[PDB]
């Protein structure tokens, strides 16, 4: 009863999902593939990717249309290497202030709705859930996280406490 | 360690399967092979090759920068658009995780590095693998197949009279044919031919026993089979004839030894009432016992050519023959061992401008006059395998070598593997599901086959003849006005023979079916005497005031009169029939006008017209549409348009509608839309399919039988076509989004993104205009509405809602 009646199960499809392809912002998948879930779990939503969560006192952006390796593989002179890679990535995404700071043929977007992919003003939490390794970092008092490719990354989901303004760097290989 | 120490002079114990079992341990597999007894096995592992492409900056427990010449991934990367790409560097797959600092010392870049999706031979002794003789001698026989209320397990072996068939929801009853029809009372003569692969003689008299409980069936069958195998020699295979229930190839209880790929594909899709067995269900058990021999001999002869008998993929996609022959030839001339994602290519990132070809010749000469009549027909087959014979490019040459090998393996008397696989080429180079840098190969085939087909059609000119229609499967020709068979014979035989000689093979041509007089403008509009009338625009006229019937009457009268003039002769009669029409057409138009405008049930005369999935015109006043359609066919079935234009000026003024107005102009009532090269699994053939043309009202239940493959009468299915249409929508919308923009004054392309005007003062405009997509979306919407494609309608409705 308790998780069913409290927890919001929200789904944000990406490229490897039915319906519209790798064209952003990704629309929700077909309603015939959601209605049976909705009718017996009313505390659930099927919506776009990226998506915006407003908390009572915080604001969060969720996005997973993968680009970390895309950033690395077409730097002008070179990327900046080692464990600093995620920090340089979030520096890039924050300074550019747009979830897709790269050309259209590399990451297609519907033209008129390009404003929806904006990272200005900066959100309180920025969740970029790429297939890349999971990470956590922060810049300009914005928290930024990748929950990562869970099957490859040793079952490393992540869990966030907005009222405490903190996150757990978990690893559920031990469950 | 190995099964034996003295393996240098290898013991010639050939394999039956290699069973990759990474579920047990990382990279572990079991090798199953033959001794004089039915089986033996050993547990083994192989170094699984990453092409890491770097040992210098990043390293592991081997400096295996060895034998650098596999350059073909680096050539496939043209789609990735990088340069000076020298071949390779290599190491084992040590973990399920990358060195994220991707780089290479041979030339700096980023690479896929994935390679070993299947083990095919050992590394750390190997035999010649001739005399493979992979048939094990003893095994149990089994079968799975079911309807939900009426399921059927079957165990029946010639060594015993006892059999078993037990599962049902009708707990009060039992399956009745399990005795008197499981006993076939029929042994087939081909058992004598394909017999010697089995130890006991085949025999088909049986009796059975029963159970009824979902807890008990699977557990009991497990105990039964494990006990049954001890009647025979202990270690055995279980020859399952088919696993059509529950996909029980993999989902069955543990076998304790090999499950072989004896199961037939799901060809007999029987979901009817199971009480009808007699000799039919008998053959479904008994002739499939012969298919033990058929499938095994098929797999063994396939293994003669690529050395994997019992775990081989044929009857599935069946690509592994081509893929692994091509791979080992690309090891003979060392290039690559290929990738196979669910997506198509062997590379990483992609520039979508090159994919636009995937996102986005067959002439209709449309002779509705008929001059050098004969009987007009031709047919062409196997054009792709005929194409490749006439010509990084060493991979293309090796593809020709492989095709030459298979067509050479077609024996001078009879062969079936080579035949089925030579047509497997024909469907493989069409199927979107195929892999190994697949779209490049599809494009290569289509380019070369276009050139070959243009040669074939063009070189008819040196013999007196003319062509009405041409497609890669269907052609229509004319040569003379009398003695149709003899007139056709000289040109068809000479052309077919010299096509083949000039193109290294093209003789897969045939010509027999009757059209002895034909006025042709596609199935959209034609008629001919053998009288057949096939006019698609006729279907868009109303049946009110008998307008369809009057169309057929006028057209048939014209055809029959001209045909009578021709037969009496065996030009000038055009004018005579034009005068007869000057009387009759006038009278008919007066009649239908007075009737249809007097019909009091007409809320609007636009409501009078029928609707079909190709309908778009705002048809309004049926006599005018009648005149327009009749005058179109008259204006195209003769070059003498003068009387037809006079008939237009007469009857349009009779209607009191003005000439040169837009309503007086003809437009095609049907928005034809073709899905090309639809592949059929019934016959391995590919053909083009129009979704708007067909008369949906007369076949609404039978639309998919109506959408038959022309090689047979087997259907194409709504589910696959609906998914295909959605995929077409997605790639088309991607092309729209990534389209170029062109300035209206100087017609060059926009160079960079930020300007709103050109270098001159001109405005930019779309290269892919939105009304094209609105029209194609309307086509897809009418298709989906007429054929009930709800998922496609969901996607279409969202795409229509987010509009101006």
Swiss-Prot record, chain A:
<comment type="function">
    <text>Accessory component of the DNA polymerase epsilon complex. Participates in DNA repair and in chromosomal DNA replication.</text>
</comment>
<protein>
    <recommendedName>
        <fullName>DNA polymerase epsilon subunit 2</fullName>
    </recommendedName>
</protein>
<comment type="similarity">
    <text>Belongs to the DNA polymerase epsilon subunit B family.</text>
</comment>
<comment type="subunit">
    <text>Component of the DNA polymerase epsilon complex consisting of four subunits: the catalytic subunit POLE and the accessory subunits POLE2, POLE3 and POLE4.</text>
</comment>
Swiss-Prot record, chain B:
<feature type="binding site">
    <location>
        <position position="680"/>
    </location>
    <ligand>
        <name>Zn(2+)</name>
    </ligand>
</feature>
<feature type="binding site">
    <location>
        <position position="758"/>
    </location>
    <ligand>
        <name>[4Fe-4S] cluster</name>
    </ligand>
</feature>
<feature type="modified residue" description="Phosphoserine">
    <location>
        <position position="1"/>
    </location>
</feature>
<feature type="zinc finger region" description="CysA-type">
    <location>
        <begin position="680"/>
        <end position="712"/>
    </location>
</feature>
<feature type="short sequence motif" description="CysB motif">
    <location>
        <begin position="743"/>
        <end position="760"/>
    </location>
</feature>
<comment type="subunit">
    <text>Component of the DNA polymerase epsilon complex consisting of four subunits: the catalytic subunit POLE and the accessory subunits POLE2, POLE3 and POLE4. Interacts with RAD17 and TOPBP1.</text>
</comment>
<feature type="binding site">
    <location>
        <position position="743"/>
    </location>
    <ligand>
        <name>[4Fe-4S] cluster</name>
    </ligand>
</feature>
<feature type="binding site">
    <location>
        <position position="760"/>
    </location>
    <ligand>
        <name>[4Fe-4S] cluster</name>
    </ligand>
</feature>
<feature type="binding site">
    <location>
        <position position="709"/>
    </location>
    <ligand>
        <name>Zn(2+)</name>
    </ligand>
</feature>
<feature type="binding site">
    <location>
        <position position="683"/>
    </location>
    <ligand>
        <name>Zn(2+)</name>
    </ligand>
</feature>
<feature type="binding site">
    <location>
        <position position="712"/>
    </location>
    <ligand>
        <name>Zn(2+)</name>
    </ligand>
</feature>
<comment type="similarity">
    <text>Belongs to the DNA polymerase type-B family.</text>
</comment>
<feature type="binding site">
    <location>
        <position position="746"/>
    </location>
    <ligand>
        <name>[4Fe-4S] cluster</name>
    </ligand>
</feature>
<comment type="function">
    <text>Catalytic component of the DNA polymerase epsilon complex. Participates in chromosomal DNA replication. Required during synthesis of the leading DNA strands at the replication fork, binds at/or near replication origins and moves along DNA with the replication fork. Has 3'-5' proofreading exonuclease activity that corrects errors arising during DNA replication. Involved in DNA synthesis during DNA repair. Along with DNA polymerase POLD1 and DNA polymerase POLK, has a role in excision repair (NER) synthesis following UV irradiation.</text>
</comment>
<protein>
    <recommendedName>
        <fullName>DNA polymerase epsilon catalytic subunit A</fullName>
    </recommendedName>
</protein>
């Amino acid at each position: 009863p308790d998780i069913h009646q409290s927890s919001r199960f929200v789904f944000v499809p990406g490229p490897e999902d039915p319906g519209f392809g790798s064209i952003l912002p990704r629309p929700p998948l077909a309603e015939s593939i959601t209605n049976e879930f909705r009718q017996r779990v009313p505390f659930s939503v099927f919506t776009t990717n990226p998506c915006r969560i407003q908390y009572c006192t915080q604001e969060i952006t969720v996005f997973r249309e993968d680009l970390v390796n895309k950033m690395c593989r077409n730097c002008v002179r070179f990327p900046s290497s080692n464990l600093a890679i995620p920090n340089h990535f979030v520096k890039t995404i924050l300074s550019q202030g747009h979830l897709t700071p790269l050309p259209l043929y590399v990451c297609p977007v519907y033209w008129a709705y390009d404003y929806a992919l904006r990272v200005y003003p900066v959100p309180d939490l920025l969740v970029i859930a790429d297939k890349y390794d999971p990470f956590t970092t922060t810049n300009t008092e914005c928290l930024c996280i990748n929950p990562g490719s869970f099957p490859r990354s040793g079952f490393s989901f992540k869990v966030f406490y907005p009222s405490n303004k903190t996150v757990e760097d978990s690893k559920l290989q031990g469950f | 360690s190995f099964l034996r120490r003295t393996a240098r002079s290898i013991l010639d114990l050939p394999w039956q399967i290699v069973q990759i079992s990474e579920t047990s341990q990382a990279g572990l597999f079991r090798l199953w092979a033959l001794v004089g007894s039915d089986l033996h096995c050993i547990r083994l592992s192989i170094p699984r090759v990453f092409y890491v492409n770097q040992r210098v900056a990043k390293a592991e427990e081997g400096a295996s920068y060895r034998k650098v010449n596999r350059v073909l991934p680096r050539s496939n990367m043209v789609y990735n658009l990088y340069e000076y790409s020298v071949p390779e560097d290599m190491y084992q797959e040590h973990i399920n995780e990358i060195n994220a600092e991707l780089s290479a010392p041979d030339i700096e870049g980023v690479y896929e590095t994935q390679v070993p999706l299947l083990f095919r031979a050992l590394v750390h002794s190997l035999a010649q693998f001739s005399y493979l003789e992979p048939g094990s001698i003893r095994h149990i026989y089994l079968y799975h197949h079911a309807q939900a209320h009426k399921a059927l397990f079957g165990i029946f072996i010639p060594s015993q009279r006892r059999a078993s068939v037990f599962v049902l929801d009708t707990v009060r009853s039992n399956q009745m044919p399990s005795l008197g029809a499981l006993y076939s009372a029929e042994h087939g003569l081909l058992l004598e031919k394909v017999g010697p692969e089995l130890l006991p003689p085949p025999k088909h008299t049986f009796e059975v026993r029963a159970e009824t409980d979902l807890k008990t069936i699977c557990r009991a069958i497990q105990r039964f089979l494990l006990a049954y195998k001890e009647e025979r020699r202990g270690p055995t295979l279980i020859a399952v004839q088919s696993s059509w229930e529950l996909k029980r190839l993999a989902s069955e209880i543990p076998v304790l030894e090999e499950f072989p790929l004896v199961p037939i594909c799901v060809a007999d899709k029987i979901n009817y009432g199971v009480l009808d067995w007699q000799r039919h269900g008998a053959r479904r058990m008994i002739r499939h016992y012969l298919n033990l021999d058929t499938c095994l001999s098929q797999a063994f002869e396939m293994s003669r050519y690529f050395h994997i008998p019992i775990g081989n993929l044929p009857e599935d996609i069946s690509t592994f023959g081509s893929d692994l022959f091509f791979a080992r030839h690309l090891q003979r001339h060392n290039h690559l061992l290929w990738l196979s994602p669910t997506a198509r290519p062997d590379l990483g990132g992609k520039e979508a401008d090159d994919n636009c070809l995937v996102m986005e010749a067959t002439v209709e000469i449309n002779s509705s006059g008929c001059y050098s009549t004969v009987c007009v027909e031709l047919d062409l087959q196997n054009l792709a395998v005929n194409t490749i014979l006439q010509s990084c490019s060493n991979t293309f040459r090796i593809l020709k070598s492989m095709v030459v090998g298979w067509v050479k393996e077609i024996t001078q008397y009879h062969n079936i593997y080579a035949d089925n696989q030579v047509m497997h080429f024909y469907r493989w180079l069409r199927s979107p599901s195929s892999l190994l840098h697949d779209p490049a190969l599809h494009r290569t085939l289509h380019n070369m086959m276009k050139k070959l087909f243009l040669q074939l059609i063009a070189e008819f000119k040196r013999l007196g003849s003319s062509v009405i229609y041409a497609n890669f499967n269907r052609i229509i020709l004319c040569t003379k006005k009398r003695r149709v068979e003899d007139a056709i014979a000289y040109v068809e035989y000479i052309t077919s023979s010299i096509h083949s000689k000039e193109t290294f093979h093209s003789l897969t041509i045939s010509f027999s079916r009757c059209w002895e007089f034909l006025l042709w403008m596609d199935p959209s509009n034609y008629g001919g005497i053998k009288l057949e009338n096939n006019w698609n625009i006729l279907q868009f006229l109303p049946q009110a005031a008998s307008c369809q019937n009057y169309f057929l009457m006028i057209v048939s009268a014209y055809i029959v009169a001209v045909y009578h003039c021709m037969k009496d002769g065996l030009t000038f009669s055009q004018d005579y029939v034009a005068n007869e029409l000057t009387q009759s057409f006038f009278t008919i138009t007066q009649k239908i006008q007075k009737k249809v405008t007097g019909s009091r049930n007409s809320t609007e005369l636009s409501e009078m017209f029928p609707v079909l999935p190709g309908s778009h015109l705002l048809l309004n006043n049926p006599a005018l549409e009648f005149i327009k359609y009749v005058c179109k066919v008259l204006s195209l079935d003769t070059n003498i348009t003068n009387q037809v234009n006079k008939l237009n000026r007469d009857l349009l003024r009779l209607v009191d509608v003005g000439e040169f107005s837009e309503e007086a102009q003809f437009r095609d009532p049907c928005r034809s839309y073709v899905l090309p090269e639809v592949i059929c699994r019934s016959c391995n053939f590919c053909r083009d399919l129009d979704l708007c043309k067909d008369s949906s009202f007369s076949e609404d239940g039978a639309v998919l039988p109506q959408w038959l493959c022309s090689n047979c009468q087997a259907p194409y299915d709504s589910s696959a076509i609906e998914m295909t249409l959605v995929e077409v929508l997605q790639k088309k919308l991607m092309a729209f989004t990534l389209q170029d923009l062109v300035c209206l004054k100087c017609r060059g392309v926009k160079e960079t993104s930020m300007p709103v005007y050109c270098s001159c003062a001109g405005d930019f405009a779309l290269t892919i205009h939105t009304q094209v997509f609105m029209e194609q979306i309307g086509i897809f919407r009418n298709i989906a509405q007429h054929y009930g494609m709800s998922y496609l309608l969901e996607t279409l409705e969202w795409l229509l809602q987010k509009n101006p």
